[PDB]
């Protein structure tokens with residue numbers, strides 16, 4: 041009679057919370073999805089060993105189209121868990137799943153875990169200064185989407201930071217690197233010419249948040265566009281004007297050039 | 306000879322991640338602060354029991370003025386942990402403490418935990434749609450903070466949601482309720498008269514996120530301003546333009562007036 045939405049956290053199998061783990065262990069059935077994102081520092085087998093439960097993986101279709109036929113029926117007479125990377129209900133379409141549960145007469149509870157939305161705080165950028173967020177998608181065929189560029193423009197104009205999710209092909213295990221994101225934005229800039237993203241724009245790259253050894257790099261596009269930030273996934277952030285304390289952190293912790301202490305403050 | 310910034314999470318001692326617990330258990334010294342937020346479902350005793358260590362609680366003054374004299378010295382010959390509610394770097398100035406650690410020649414690591422910043426996902430409002438955030442601070446003497454009003458205005462003009470962290474006076478054991486925040490906002494509206502926050506404004510209240518039964522309520526200020534949302538902590542949210550599915554969730558899960566289902570595109 042109960043469905044638990046449990047977050048797996050940021051990077052590896054130890055990023056789930058104590059509460060999430062213990063609840064998952066008490067559930068009769070455990071489902072999970074890895075299409076919104078993947079857990080780069082672990083594997084399905086490792087997650088299964090930790091929880092001590094067989095984990096049934098669901099595709100995007102399984103969830104978006106058949107959540108009520110796959111998961112909810114079992115939640116009617118059993119305790120069921122639905123695992124997702126990060127914090128549950130962060131992914132745009134997930135909240136609606138709770139409405140589906142309600143409609144099926146199924147109780148649902150949310151067990152939180154770390155999300156990249158809050159983990160980006162490790163970049164030293166103040167959380168309150170983040171504006172609307174967006175996702176950088178690849179142009180394809182006769183389609184060249186550029187809304188993420190406008191998001192950066194509107195946030196920066198108001199002195200706000202912009203966190204950018206990069207394209208991911210979960211099934212194909214293909215990720216867009218920060219380097220690729222930068223090249224794309226420069227391309228959009230050449231077309232838009234709004235002076236939003238150029239070789240002189242200061243950016244921050246965050247890779248493997250959650251790991252004990254994440255990669256946090258800050259610098260101008262001209263110098264970072266060909267740098268190696270390691271394995272994906274990568275998060276690209278275009279900061280708005282910096283508070284001196286944010287700049288100092290980027291210099292001391294993210295290897296930013298001293299230059300930002302005068303140029304971007 | 307290392308320092309760990311470990312978040313304890315949203316509500317109780319089990320909101321810590323497995324990673325954080327296992328690391329906290331093996332630290333020689335454990336410090337913590339409980340002035341940046343409130344963990345309404347646990348006690349220092351329960352936290353110490355879980356980690357199996359005596360915890361030295363520090364005041365805002367101990368940290369802000371003496372972190373380098375109290376904590377860092379021990380981090381040179383021992384493994385030390387600094388625990389905080391929620392995520393250690395979210396809506397705190399703790400990130401700067403990493404600079405102090407570095408300058409003191411002490412390596413530091415950050416272990417994230419669920420944060421209220423991402424926990425807002427449980428309100429059904431798309432997290433990417435949140436704009437600049439703000440804090441509603443208690444007026445003091447002749448000083449009456451009002452900047453948070455302009456933040457709501459700026460975001461609303463852009464159709465973005467506004468998350469409002471609420472004030473806290475740990476030493477006085479005072480935690481601002483959503484009701485108090487609404488009263489303060491109405492007073493600011495009277496002064497500025499920008500039509501930003503009135504009795505007809507739709508707001509969402511999230512209380513005690515992290516608990517199994519948090520209070521999630523949506524409605525007009527006139528109807529919620531005197532409603533009991535249970536014990537603190539609380540956060541107040543002023544949504545911007547709603548997507549149909551956001552309104553549906555607010556009605557089905559947050560008990561919002563069915564009339565908001567009819568969005569004015």
Ligand SMILES: Nc1ncnc2c1ncn2[C@@H]1O[C@H](CSCC[C@H](N)C(=O)O)[C@@H](O)[C@H]1O
Pocket residue numbers: 158315316341342343390391392393394395396397419420421422469470471472473511512513514515538539540
């Ligand atoms: N469980 C919870 N439920 C509702 N609001 C919460 C909350 N935890 C924190 N807050 C809100 O955030 C304020 C503290 S700001 C510090 C936030 C913390 N670092 C984190 O990561 O969550 C509180 O005064 C309150 O308004």
Ligand code: NA
Pocket residue numbers: 157170171172173432433435436
């Ligand atoms: Na945000």
